[PDB]
């Protein structure tokens, strides 16, 4: 598997205002079509890890978090795996206030 747009995938620092939505993408291809899982600060990102939970759209390779709160701060990492290899990218999320 391989990043489709490796130049956008160099971006790592993301800041977003509270109570809005953060969206992270990691688009890929890889024979056979790889699957994607998400990590938060190293650990597996699971639905109960934040209040709203999180939504996905695999078909557009994206993790989504609505209503962000200062505790959503941290590192988010997409893992893309097929039978033949795993690729790895981290975004860093910051939350702005007022």
């Amino acid at each position: 598997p391989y990043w489709t747009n490796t130049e956008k995938m160099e971006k790592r620092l993301h800041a977003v205002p509270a109570a809005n939505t953060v969206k992270f993408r990691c688009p890929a291809g890889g024979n056979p079509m790889p699957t994607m899982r998400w990590l938060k600060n190293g650990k597996e990102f699971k639905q109960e890890h934040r209040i709203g939970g999180y939504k996905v759209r695999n078909q557009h390779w994206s993790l989504i978090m609505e209503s962000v709160v200062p505790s959503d701060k941290g590192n988010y990492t997409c893992v893309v795996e097929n039978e033949y290899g795993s690729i790895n990218h981290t975004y860093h999320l910051d939350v702005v206030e007022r």
């Epitope: 939505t21 969206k23 007022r98």
Partner: antibody
Framework: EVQLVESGGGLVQPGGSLRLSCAAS????????ISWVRQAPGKGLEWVGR????????NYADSVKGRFTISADTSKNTAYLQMNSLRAEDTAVYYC????????????????????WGQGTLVTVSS | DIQMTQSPSSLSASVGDRVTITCRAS??????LAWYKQKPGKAPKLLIY???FLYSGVPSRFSGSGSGTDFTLTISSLQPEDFATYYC?????????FGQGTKVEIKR
């Protein structure tokens, strides 16, 4: 309950001015935004403009730039549309909508979602 | 601008019917597309955002799909309160534009 109540509507003269108000309850928009969209009687929806307090951006439909001004008062939890130099074709129901953003590094823009609208106030411009 | 074209403009469907309304954009809008429902005299209500996300409180019989320049709003089993006018709206960095609307009448 999330509520948005619009007031300030009415019949006003061409060349004249009007201030619409958008009072919010059940939520604050200190870090989100407010949009205005209008609907001429019998017609479809027309975006008027938007201010986002979280990202600091303000933008208007070309048909409305420089005549209409969108502001907010956090103290009053209220948003405003100052309409100056009104013409007959500004005649419409004006809606305000709570507006948040989808922030994605992957693209060039903030995708804004107008998820909750007030019931609207009717503005009639006529001599 | 980014022109949005809805089809059909108006339609007559029976209760329980499956209804499809399509929205085409004059250029690629990705999945940056929202659908609104509006009953006459009231504010529009958001049904779907980002092409396929169902908004809170919106019944699951509404679903959205599409990307690029083609989008569809689906109503699987048309209920009596679903009779209204439906609007799509693209939400790119280009100035926001709406479709002209699709009005759904009740057949009897």
């Amino acid at each position: 309950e999330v509520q948005l109540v619009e007031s300030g509507g009415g019949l006003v003269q061409p060349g004249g001015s009007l201030r619409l108000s958008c009072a919010a309850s059940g939520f604050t928009f200190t870090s989100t935004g407010i949009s205005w969209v209008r609907q001429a009687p019998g017609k479809g929806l027309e975006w008027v403009g938007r201010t986002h307090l979280g990202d600091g951006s303000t933008n208007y439909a070309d048909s409305v730039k420089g005549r209409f001004t969108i502001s907010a008062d956090t103290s009053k939890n209220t948003a405003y549309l100052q309409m100056n130099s009104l013409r007959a074709e500004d005649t419409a129901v004006y809606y305000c909508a709570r507006t948040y953003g989808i922030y994605d590094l992957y693209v060039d823009y903030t995708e804004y979602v107008m998820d909750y609208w007030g019931q609207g106030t009717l503005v009639t411009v006529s001599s | 601008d980014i022109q949005m074209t809805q089809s059909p403009s108006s339609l007559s469907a029976s209760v329980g019917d499956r209804v499809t309304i399509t929205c085409r954009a004059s250029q690629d809008v990705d999945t940056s597309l929202a659908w609104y429902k509006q009953k006459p005299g009231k504010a529009p209500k958001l049904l779907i955002y980002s092409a396929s996300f169902l908004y809170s409180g919106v019944p699951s019989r509404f679903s959205g799909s599409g990307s690029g320049t083609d989008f569809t709003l689906t109503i699987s089993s048309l209920q009596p309160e679903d009779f209204a006018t439906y609007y799509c709206q693209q939400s790119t960095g280009h100035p926001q534009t709406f479709g002209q609307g699709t009005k759904v009448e009740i057949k009897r």
